[PDB]
Amino acid sequence: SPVALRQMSCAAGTTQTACTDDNALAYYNNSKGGRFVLALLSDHQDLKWARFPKSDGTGTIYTELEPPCRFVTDTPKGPKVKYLYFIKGLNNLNRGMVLESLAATVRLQLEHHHH
Amino acid sequence: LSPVALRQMSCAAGTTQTACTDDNALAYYNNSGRFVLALLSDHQDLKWARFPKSTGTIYTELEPPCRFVTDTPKGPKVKYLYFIKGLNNLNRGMVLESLAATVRLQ
């Protein structure tokens, strides 16, 4: 059942060329095929591609995003408007997963280490 | 009904409404009132669960259970996941994600 969602920074943009670097936060799990990206969380409202380098290091990958959902969140600095991007074709089951994970941060391991 | 980190509450379930008597199950719910999405339990015969309303009490039917293993502070354990009758996939996705992130390695 551990289809637990992990997160990491990634490159995103309005065009494949426009992708540059840590421009967003990507939600993914390991559904066999290495890393499977489900959604992007960013401050930018017109992103259309999430970019990740291939596993074997032989090229790169660009995944398509659906138009984002705009939403507010509270923070120490105050309210903040964020954009949630589900990848194209993502089903409601996976959308729900992203949501719960977004609702409360929880470490997936016990050892002193990133999430 | 909007998004919010799921919460859990102990509740009584049974194979019949009459059977629901003592707390023997954990119920995931959304409070965006309490909307119960699913039940986690050690028994596999469960078919009903009651929730003493926020006046009266509520009985909600359950769908067939799903077996699954879980680490705990005292060794692994087997358990059963029950979804409320007719739950949509978006909500099930929220439950499955909570369960999935419920493990302990090394």
Swiss-Prot record, chain B:
This is RNA-capping enzyme subunit nsp9. It is found in: Host cytoplasm, Host perinuclear region; Host cytoplasm; Host endoplasmic reticulum. Residues 1-106 form the Nsp9 ssRNA-binding domain. Homodimer. Catalytic subunit of viral RNA capping enzyme which catalyzes the RNA guanylyltransferase reaction for genomic and sub-genomic RNAs. The kinase-like NiRAN domain of NSP12 transfers RNA to the amino terminus of NSP9, forming a covalent RNA-protein intermediate. Subsequently, the NiRAN domain transfers RNA to GDP, forming the core cap structure GpppA-RNA. The NSP14 and NSP16 methyltransferases then add methyl groups to form functional cap structures. It catalyses: a 5'-end diphospho-ribonucleoside in mRNA + GTP + H(+) = a 5'-end (5'-triphosphoguanosine)-ribonucleoside in mRNA + diphosphate. The chain holds residues 4121 to 4230 of 4382 of the full protein.
